[PDB]
Amino acid sequence: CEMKRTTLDSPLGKLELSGCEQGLHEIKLLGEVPAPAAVLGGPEPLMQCTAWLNAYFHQPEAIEEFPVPALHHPVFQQESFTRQVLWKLLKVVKFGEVISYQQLAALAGNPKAARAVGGAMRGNPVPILIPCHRVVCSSGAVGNYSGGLAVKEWLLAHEGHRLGKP
Ligand SMILES: [Zn+2]
């Protein structure tokens, strides 16, 4: 599992994608014009990811046409409420949609685990790809975000919600 990295510039700042032949491991935000990945080439999960992010930001209308790379981060290798949460979020909530913590909890098999769900969100190694930014309060409020409220709001405004891009 030899780690490979590449960085990509985005409207959110520099993104560091890391992965192996078996799958994308992480997307990390290091902090108007589409940019290329600093290092071109494989492994495949990294090319898929970079292609996916470029579309998400600059070609959103076509986001569904891009394959979601295979994930190989430790959290996905073994079972856990955290994995079940991340996967459920990944496969269910799409571009423009939001979900409350309670709905995600129930979706993961336990309606009373909204808190554990909120916790599982901080353990997401691949933000944006796995839309933890779409998990919001049932009150209508945006809610907490591991990467800062401002980023969460940007992503949401980016997907159509009536919030100004901070
Ligand atoms: Zn790996």
Domains of the chain: 2-72 (3.30.160.70), 73-162 (1.10.10.10)
Ligand 1 center–CA 163 separation, angstroms: 37
Q: Diameter of the chain by CA atoms? A: 45
Confirm or deny that 139 is annotated as ligand binding: no
Active site residues: 132
Experimental method used, please?
A: X-ray
Amino acid at 9: D
Q: How many CB atoms lie within 10 A of CB 53?
A: 21
Ligand 1 center–CA 23 separation, angstroms: 6
Are 17 and 27 in contact, with CB atoms under 8 Å apart?
yes
Confirm or deny that 144 is annotated as ligand binding: no
Strand stretches in the chain, DSSP E: 4-10, 13-20, 23-29, 99-100, 135-136
What is the structure's resolution, reported in angstroms to one decimal?
A: 2.5
Going by DSSP bridges, is the β-strand pair 23-29/13-20 parallel, antiparallel, or unpaired? antiparallel
Confirm or deny that 82 is annotated as ligand binding: yes
Ligand 1 center–CA 157 separation, angstroms: 33
